């Protein structure tokens, strides 16, 4: 066509030509002769108000891989008709290819596995852009150290070296650790790292007391790395500790660091070595029992927990585990009786009603579970040191949130209040943050939710990605509602 002469025909005749030129373009597109584009341009010169011509041009650029031209032409289609289905999906498809996942998800949302694919791509892009010196929550630290005999651990620092200038700092580190307080863990973490650095220097005139104190510093600085999820850092120090002076703790800790869902043969051989070094050490049996428990080997778990109990009968944790095993074995009555007998011995410890409340919740006795968590919270408030920390708040808030919308606005507000308090009392709890974030999102407090989801991701690899995913999904909802 000479478009010169066509443009000077009538409006019926000029449009008629558009339908005719468009159709010629379509013939070529079907014949994989995309350079189609020329005929559509011709059509545009006669009818620039037709979004089909721009949308068709963009289908050609999809076919030849010009992703930037796809965006330009689908955009032109969409500026005429913002709800054009093919333009929206083509533009989302090209944006995904260019790595503009939020733009893709936006158009896919307006259009309505594709959404989910781009969400994942966005979460990994953001996780990779973003990404430890950060401890787990004080609640989780108190639980981890609950089995150990503080006095024994603090007194295991040797005061008799002629060269050791770090032992007093090491002693303060352990003192702080076993105070089981928010300040205690932060100070322990600081001073263990400092003691280890001093020990590396000292090791380089050395004597055996200094070697054993170094092994002790290395052993705890190692488990702190494990707790921070720096597994290689942990293994390096634990191995150094073993190379200096083998101890049951260093074997327990190295086993935890190298634990393997596939083969648990190595885990159990470390524990045999720990047993050999000291067959009269309660935490060895307790931790091995924990692993048999996790592997659902209840007979062997019971044996080990009974051994831990028989070596340190003043520690509440072996009793609790034994009661939990009864419940898992299919014996609630006997479990409840064991918890009650344990509550008689340890009437001030919140560990007993907190673990029992978890069993009640599993049974669906939510009202009794909440009463147990109420008691646990009061017992916890009265103690100087952390026992169960924010566990009861999270426990009760989770029940109340699920009961509220299964809206009971009083239970839902109560849950918010509980999780808000939990977040303030234990700022490094990702559990508390994510819990609160989901409720904020239900209330359409999107900005608040996003901040909580993002903090949780800082705090939490698959966990970091899950939190990042919640945050990125919420940012898209925010963008949609903004327009």
């Amino acid at each position: 066509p000479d478009i010169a002469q066509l443009k000077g025909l009538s409006p019926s005749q000029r449009q008629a030509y558009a339908v005719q030129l468009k159709n010629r373009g379509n013939h070529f597109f079907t014949a994989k002769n995309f350079n189609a584009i020329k005929y559509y341009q011709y059509a545009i010169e006669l009818d620039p108000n037709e979004p089909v011509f721009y949308s068709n041009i963009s289908a050609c650029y999809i076919s030849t891989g010009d992703l930037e031209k796809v965006i330009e032409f689908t955009t032109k289609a969409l500026e005429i008709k913002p709800d054009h289905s093919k333009a929206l999906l083509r533009r989302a498809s090209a944006n995904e290819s260019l790595g503009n996942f939020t733009d893709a998800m936006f158009d896919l949302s307006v259009l309505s596995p594709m959404l989910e694919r781009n969400l994942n791509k966005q979460a990994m892009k953001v996780l990779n852009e973003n990404l430890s010196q950060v401890l787990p929550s004080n609640t989780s630290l108190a639980s981890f150290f609950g089995i150990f005999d503080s006095h024994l651990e603090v007194s295991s620092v040797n005061t008799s070296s002629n060269y050791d200038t770090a032992y007093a700092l090491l002693s303060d580190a352990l003192q702080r650790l076993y105070s089981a307080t928010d300040e205690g863990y932060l100070v322990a973490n600081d001073l263990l790292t400092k003691s280890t650095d001093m020990y590396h220097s000292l090791l380089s005139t050395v004597d055996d007391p200094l070697r054993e104190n170094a092994a002790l510093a290395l052993c705890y600085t190692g488990i702190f790395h494990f707790l921070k999820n720096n597994l290689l850092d942990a293994q390096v120090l634990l191995q150094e500790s073993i190379n200096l002076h083998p101890t049951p703790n260093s074997y327990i800790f190295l086993a935890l660091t190298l634990a393997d869902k596939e083969n648990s043969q190595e885990f159990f051989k470390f524990f045999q070595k720990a047993v050999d070094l000291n067959p009269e050490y309660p935490p060895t049996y307790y931790h091995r029992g924990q692993m048999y428990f996790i592997l659902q080997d209840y007979k062997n778990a019971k044996e080990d927990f009974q051994k831990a109990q028989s070596l340190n009968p003043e520690n509440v944790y072996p009793y609790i585990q034994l009661a939990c095993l009864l419940y898992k074995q299919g014996k609630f009555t006997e479990s409840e009786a064991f918890f009650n007998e344990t509550k008689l011995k340890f009437p001030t410890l919140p560990e007993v009603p907190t673990f029992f409340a978890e069993i009640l919740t599993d049974r669906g006795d939510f009202d009794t579970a909440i009463k147990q968590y109420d008691i646990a919270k009061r017992l916890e408030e009265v103690q100087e040191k952390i026992h169960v920390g924010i566990g009861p708040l999270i426990g009760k808030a989770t029940i109340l949130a699920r009961q509220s919308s299964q809206l009971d606005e009083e239970k839902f507000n109560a849950a918010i209040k509980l999780l808000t308090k939990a977040c303030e009392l234990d700022p490094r709890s990702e559990q508390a943050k994510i819990g609160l974030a989901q409720l904020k999102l239900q209330m359409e407090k999107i900005d608040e939710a996003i901040e909580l989801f993002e903090d949780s991701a800082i705090l939490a690899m698959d966990e970091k990605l899950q939190a990042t995913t919640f945050a990125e999904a919420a940012k898209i909802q925010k963008r949609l509602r903004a327009d």
Binding site: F29, S55, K86
Partner: peptide, 5 residues
């Protein structure tokens, strides 16, 4: 969705 109109 891959077809011209």
């Amino acid at each position: 969705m891959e077809e011209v109109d």
